[PDB]
Curated annotation (Swiss-Prot), chain A:
The gene is RPS24. Gene3D superfamilies: 3.30.70.3370. This is Small ribosomal subunit protein eS24. GO terms for molecular function: RNA binding; structural constituent of ribosome; translation initiation factor binding. Keywords: Acetylation, Cytoplasm, Diamond-Blackfan anemia, Isopeptide bond, Nucleus, Phosphoprotein, Ribonucleoprotein, Ribosomal protein, Ubl conjugation. There is a cross-link at K35 (Glycyl lysine isopeptide (Lys-Gly) (interchain with G-Cter in SUMO2)). Residues 99-117 have a biased composition (Basic residues). It comes from Homo sapiens (Human). The keyword Ribosomal protein applies. Belongs to the eukaryotic ribosomal protein eS24 family. GO terms for cellular component: cytoplasm; cytosol; cytosolic ribosome; cytosolic small ribosomal subunit; endoplasmic reticulum; membrane; nucleolus; nucleoplasm. GO terms for biological process: cytoplasmic translation; erythrocyte homeostasis; ribosomal small subunit biogenesis; rRNA processing; translation. Residues 90-124 are annotated as: Disordered. It is linked to Diamond-Blackfan anemia 3: A form of Diamond-Blackfan anemia, a congenital non-regenerative hypoplastic anemia that usually presents early in infancy. Diamond-Blackfan anemia is characterized by a moderate to severe macrocytic anemia, erythroblastopenia, and an increased risk of developing leukemia. 30 to 40% of Diamond-Blackfan anemia patients present with short stature and congenital anomalies, the most frequent being craniofacial (Pierre-Robin syndrome and cleft palate), thumb and urogenital anomalies.
UniProtKB/Swiss-Prot annotation, chain B:
The modification N6-succinyllysine is found at K48. It comes from the Eukaryota. It is found in: Cytoplasm; Nucleus. Coiled coil: none annotated. Component of the 40S subunit of the ribosome. Residues 20-33 have a biased composition (Basic residues). Component of the 40S subunit of the ribosome. Contributes to the assembly and function of 40S ribosomal subunits. This is Small ribosomal subunit protein eS30. Residues 7-33 are annotated as: Disordered.
Curated annotation (Swiss-Prot), chain C:
One of its GO terms (molecular function) is RNA binding. It is linked to Brachycephaly, trichomegaly, and developmental delay: An autosomal dominant developmental disorder characterized by brachycephaly, ciliary trichomegaly, dysmorphic features of the face and hands, hearing loss, and developmental delay with short stature. Intellectual disability and autism spectrum disorder may be present in some patients. Residues 1-19 have a biased composition (Basic residues). The modification 3-hydroxyproline is found at P61. Residues 1-25 are annotated as: Disordered. This is Small ribosomal subunit protein uS12. The gene is RPS23. The keyword Ubl conjugation applies. Component of the 40S small ribosomal subunit. Part of the small subunit (SSU) processome, composed of more than 70 proteins and the RNA chaperone small nucleolar RNA (snoRNA) U3. InterPro entries: NA-bd_OB-fold, Ribosomal_uS12, Ribosomal_uS12_euk/arc. There is a cross-link at K36 (Glycyl lysine isopeptide (Lys-Gly) (interchain with G-Cter in SUMO2)). CDD domains: Ribosomal_S23.
Curated annotation (Swiss-Prot), chain F:
It is linked to Diamond-Blackfan anemia 20: A form of Diamond-Blackfan anemia, a congenital non-regenerative hypoplastic anemia that usually presents early in infancy. Diamond-Blackfan anemia is characterized by a moderate to severe macrocytic anemia, erythroblastopenia, and an increased risk of malignancy. 30 to 40% of Diamond-Blackfan anemia patients present with short stature and congenital anomalies, the most frequent being craniofacial (Pierre-Robin syndrome and cleft palate), thumb and urogenital anomalies. DBA20 inheritance is autosomal dominant. HAMAP family: Ribosomal_uS8_A (MF_01302_A). GO terms for molecular function: RNA binding; structural constituent of ribosome. InterPro entries: Ribosomal_uS8, Ribosomal_uS8_CS, Ribosomal_uS8_sf. PROSITE patterns: RIBOSOMAL_S8. Its main location: cytoplasm. It is found in: Cytoplasm; Nucleus, Nucleolus. This is Small ribosomal subunit protein uS8. The modification N6-succinyllysine is found at K87. Keywords: Cytoplasm, Diamond-Blackfan anemia, Nucleus, Ribonucleoprotein, Ribosomal protein. Transmembrane segments: none annotated.
Length: 124, 56, 141, 262, 180, 129
RNA sequence: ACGGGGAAUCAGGGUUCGAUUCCGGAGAGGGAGCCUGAGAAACGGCUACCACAUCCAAGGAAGGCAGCAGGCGCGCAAAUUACCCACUCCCGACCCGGGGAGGUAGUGACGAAAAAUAACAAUACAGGACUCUUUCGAGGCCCUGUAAUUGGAAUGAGUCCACUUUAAAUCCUUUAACGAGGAUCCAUUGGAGGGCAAGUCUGGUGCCAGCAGCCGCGGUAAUUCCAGCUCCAAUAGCGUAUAUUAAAGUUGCUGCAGUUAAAAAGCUCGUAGUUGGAUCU
């Protein structure tokens, strides 16, 4: 019926101002439980708001019994925006990466290498 | 030493079309069938140990 | 008899090393004359251009015309005679087409009736002789 | 070839780091520093692979640039800083002190120490020499140059160094009957009492060391590090007390512990 | 340079004589009795048995009181009695040499779910395991060559999602019941 | 000329045992020959023997009990470590239930089993079974 | 012929391989000479010559993929002009920038691991036998096979959602929907004289065509060509060529031979080499 959540390997990382844990999601007859509701279950279980919880790396076991992932719960949203990888912040819509490919940037740099002075900014 | 006859016998062989038969079993079922034919009953033997493809 | 002494290691090893040269296989594989005289140059296969179709007469006990082809290897321009294995397979070959030729299975030795033929045609015009033989593929146009 | 190398392959790294083989091609190349490349624990290995405060090297860098880690009382921000034998790693933010010590398997154990024992360390003096207008200088295994040491202190002795001032508090002579640890070779990490040093002029001296369980072994003189006067160590020891167990004894202990634990 | 590991090994050995009639009959008897797919499974179990026997011989050539003999012989015998091939009362190194291939073939999951009455035959056992109807403890096991340990024998159930152990009708039952 | 007097002694013993004789004369004798014969005797393979003292080099009359299949020398005297002893046993001995390889070690001349018991290698002198 | 760690094979001994991700060396088209620098005789630095080659307005200028992709060429013989700095680490003045190192996907039957192509019941049929009388027969009381017999059960290949994965992604895993009776959702590659397992069945050809590693088969009844049928060998694999290992005690140290099968020098002497009698508690 309902989805169960357990936290195996819990530690309080005061160095990174967070709590890090391994999350076991018991969901016998459901698809891999979405991260957005794993976050709210963790928020209820640890008495905090669900915007400081970053869950990732969820792997369902063969047969469909349980899913194992990792999770962080930060002391504040600012410490999350400080100590979290940019992609995991972007998963929460807290960060946007540049809209340029590696090719575009590399050829832009090599084109700028051929000009000297303020004219470098005139080529893109 | 003439090369004029090169596809003589294959060319002049009366062409026969292969029949249509139900598919053979594959994998474990074929081995099960072989084991059944060779070890389960003594119906296909005579005490003379005849061969699987005996046309006699 | 042989020398059995605690200090005869050098003599024994030298004798073995000299006597290995009297083994035909060792001398063949360690002189370089066989490698330099091998038409394939040490390869397993070689591509060549058919120069003509020939009919080689089987050895004396048997009586047949084995269809072979004279092919000049692209790698070194050497002319060899390659057997066309199956029946009607010489019809699949045309003059001045490219054939992939392998050995005959006996490592530079003639095989069976065919005298002096140590190569067989494997592909003609980038299509295997077996695929043409069974109708799986047709000659490129 | 030309100039120094700057990389270290994962499989060419010291085996006591217990690194994987599938987690990348490279291992953290330790920076130049007090300890050798193959006898050190880089700060990233300690803070990520051992203590697991970080999951990636970027998190190790984040931890270190907040100035949370001190080696021998000095804040280190180099995540590849070579930390080696007897170094004190202090994290005031989480309030814990460790001493980089060897385990009987020859690996740097995670050995927690008290705040009172984090105030000092032990250093084996590597050389003593008179220089610069007659001042005696002493060089230690961690490249710490101390001027005006006690005239009794000689090479292969151990000195207790106060980490705040870097000055000698006390010293243990290299002598038979003194407790010591093995810092290299097959017997690395074992702790015992010195019984006999047999000298080889022009070659390596060999020192024989007897365990606290009666077992005896030998090492080269360079691999001995005097730990205490007599049999009492001047520093705290790991869960194992330097007594290396055989594979049979270790298997029996593991089986009994699992039987009595769960 | 890549982080990839190239470590692999062949888990079987091809026989030297390809057309030995006695060997063919023996392998076919094993295949039919234990419901194996091809000769390669027989050769695989043979290779495992041969490697175990070679290790046992190498340990037996050692001095009895040699510590490596004690340690590795104890480990090997412990593993053999752990997987049920070796009886706990027969725990000597020279008792390893007396093991057969059928001893290891009996411990397969296919043979076990046939013996425990879960399947009507050994081929039904294979198709049951391959179709995810069998679980070992809480884990749905899908491999028929899965070698069952002694402590795992008592937990071979019929799964909690299988139509035979969990009561969700399959595709065919539901489709037929729709027309009814 | 004559070399390896132990080889000649063992050849004489072997040829006399093949012929069914109850005694064999070995000449010249030596310390190695006497030690080998004693090792042979303690295992019951030859029985008692007598050393005739001529004032240049000894002779030995060995009583023969027909329990000896083959006595042989290993020339040259290969130096054998404890690891290679099993390979030498497999090569030279008819079975693992009987047969002895004789080695000269720093502890004396003895069979391979006694060499393993004393934990020593040596140089292989020969074998008997 | 880059060396080694090492690889294949291997009863014991050995034989062969090691360009190839780790360590060490060497080189950057071939030579040579240098600047800078802690470190280079550096080549994604410079200077020449030699070879090749690009642009030119003919005055000059500019080159170095044995980096990553990608072409040409060579050949029997080897993949994308893709995405990313999320991992691993490296570099910098640097918590922030950059990295074709590296990671990720694409092509991939190099190889290695697991593993489908059906399972089960009733129906009778060729059916057996410790079932029983009395061999004769009853044969759902102990199991195979005719199956274009019947019957429902099961399931994944596939298609398609939603998660999960991950730096976007893909794949695997998970969930739901559809998805199997020629379950046509149709297994192949070689063979059937011996070696060596499996037909002197039928038709065709007639020393031809061909087969055949070897021995041999084929000249009008071919167990061997060409086919059909049947059969067996391995099986998502199998055949072929070459090289190599075992077989090879046919290189023999273990462990071979030398009267006649291949072989003791015509005969002595003789230095190096190899080997060398007893004896000392």
């Amino acid at each position: 019926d309902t989805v169960t959540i357990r936290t195996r390997k819990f530690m309080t990382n005061r160095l990174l101002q967070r709590k890090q844990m391994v999350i076991d999601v018991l969901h016998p007859g459901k698809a891999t439980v979405p991260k957005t509701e794993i976050r709210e279950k963790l928020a209820k279980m640890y008495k905090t708001t669900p915007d400081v919880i970053f869950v990732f790396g969820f792997r369902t076991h063969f047969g469909g019994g349980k899913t194992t992932g990792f999770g962080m719960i930060y002391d504040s949203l600012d410490y999350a925006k400080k100590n979290e990888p940019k992609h995991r912040l972007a998963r929460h819509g807290l960060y946007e990466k540049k809209k340029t490919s590696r090719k575009q940037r590399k050829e832009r740099k090599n084109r700028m290498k051929k000009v000297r002075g303020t004219a470098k900014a005139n080529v893109g | 030493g003439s090369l004029a006859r090169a596809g003589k016998v294959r060319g002049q062989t009366p062409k026969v079309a292969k029949q249509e038969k139900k598919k053979k079993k594959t994998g474990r079922a074929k081995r099960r069938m072989q084991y059944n034919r060779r070890f389960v009953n003594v119906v296909p033997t005579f005490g003379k140990k005849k061969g699987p493809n005996a046309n006699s | 008899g042989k020398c059995r002494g605690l200090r005869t290691a050098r003599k024994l090893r030298s004798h073995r090393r000299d006597q290995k040269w009297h083994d035909k296989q060792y001398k063949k594989a360690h002189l370089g004359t066989a490698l330099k005289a091998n038409p394939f140059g040490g390869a397993s296969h070689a591509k060549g251009i058919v120069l003509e179709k020939v009919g080689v007469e089987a050895k004396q006990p048997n009586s047949a015309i084995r269809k072979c082809v004279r092919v000049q290897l692209i790698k070194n321009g050497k002319k060899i005679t390659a057997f066309v294995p199956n029946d009607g397979c010489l019809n699949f070959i045309e003059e001045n087409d490219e054939v992939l030729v392998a050995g005959f299975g006996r490592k530079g030795h003639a095989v069976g009736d065919i005298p002096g033929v140590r190569f067989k045609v494997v592909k003609v015009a980038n299509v295997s002789l077996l695929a043409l033989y069974k109708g799986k593929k047709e000659r490129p146009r | 070839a030309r100039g120094p190398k700057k990389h270290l392959k994962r499989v060419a790294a010291p085996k006591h780091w217990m690194l994987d083989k599938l987690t990348g091609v490279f291992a953290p190349r330790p920076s130049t520093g007090p300890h050798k490349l193959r006898e050190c624990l880089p700060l990233i290995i300690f803070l990520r692979n051992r203590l697991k405060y970080a999951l990636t090297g970027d998190e190790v860098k984040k931890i270190c640039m907040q100035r949370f880690i001190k080696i021998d009382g000095k804040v280190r921000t180099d995540i590849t800083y070579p930390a080696g034998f007897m170094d004190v790693i202090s994290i005031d933010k989480t309030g814990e002190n460790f001493r980089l010590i060897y385990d009987t398997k020859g690996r740097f154990a995670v050995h927690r120490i008290t705040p009172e024992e984090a105030k000092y360390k032990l250093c084996k003096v590597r050389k003593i020499f008179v220089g610069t207008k007659g001042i005696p200088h002493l060089v230690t295994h961690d490249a710490r140059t101390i001027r005006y040491p006690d005239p009794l202190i000689k090479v292969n002795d151990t000195i207790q160094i106060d980490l705040e001032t870097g000055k000698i508090t006390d010293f243990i002579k290299f002598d038979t009957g003194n407790l010591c640890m093995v810092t290299g070779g097959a017997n690395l990490g074992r702790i015992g009492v010195i019984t006999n040093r047999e000298r080889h002029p022009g070659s390596f001296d060999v020192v024989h060391v007897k365990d606290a369980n009666g077992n005896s072994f030998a090492t080269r003189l360079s691999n001995i590090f005097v730990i205490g006067k007599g049999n009492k160590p001047w520093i705290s020891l790991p869960r194992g007390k330097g007594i290396r167990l055989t594979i049979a004894e270790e298997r029996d202990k593991r089986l009994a512990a699992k039987q009595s634990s769960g | 340079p890549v982080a990839r590991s190239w470590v692999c090994r062949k888990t079987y050995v091809t026989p030297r004589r390809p057309f030995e009639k006695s060997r063919l009959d023996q392998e076919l008897k094993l295949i039919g009795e234990y419901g194996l797919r091809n000769k390669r499974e027989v050769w695989r179990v043979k290779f495992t048995l041969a490697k175990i026997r070679k290790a046992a011989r190498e340990l037996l050539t050692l001095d009895e009181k040699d510590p490596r003999r004690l340690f590795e012989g104890n480990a090997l015998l412990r593993r053999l009695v752990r997987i049920g091939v070796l009886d706990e009362g027969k725990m000597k190194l020279d008792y390893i040499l007396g093991l057969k291939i059928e001893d290891f073939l009996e411990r397969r999951l296919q043979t076990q779910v046939f013996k425990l009455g879960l399947a009507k035959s050994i081929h039904h056992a294979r198709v049951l395991i391959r179709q995810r109807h069998i679980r070992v403890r809480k884990q749905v096991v899908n491999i028929p060559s899965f070698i069952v340990r002694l402590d795992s024998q008592k937990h071979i159930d019929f799964s909690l999602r299988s139509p035979y152990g969990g009561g969700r009708p399959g595709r065919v039952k539901r489709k037929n019941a729709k027309k009814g | 000329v004559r070399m390896n007097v132990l080889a000649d002694a063992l050849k004489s013993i072997n040829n006399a045992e093949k012929r069914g004789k109850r005694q064999v004369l070995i000449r010249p004798c030596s310390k190695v020959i006497v030690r080998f014969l004693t090792v042979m005797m303690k295992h019951g393979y030859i029985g008692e023997f007598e050393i005739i003292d001529d004032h240049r080099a000894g002779k030995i009359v060995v009583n023969l009990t027909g329990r000896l299949n083959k006595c042989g020398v290993i020339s040259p005297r290969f130096d054998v470590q404890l690891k290679d002893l099993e390979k030498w046993q497999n090569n030279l001995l008819p079975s693992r239930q009987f047969g002895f390889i004789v080695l000269t070690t720093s502890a004396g001349i003895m069979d391979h089993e006694e060499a393993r018991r004393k934990h020593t290698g040596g140089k292989i002198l020969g074998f008997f079974f």
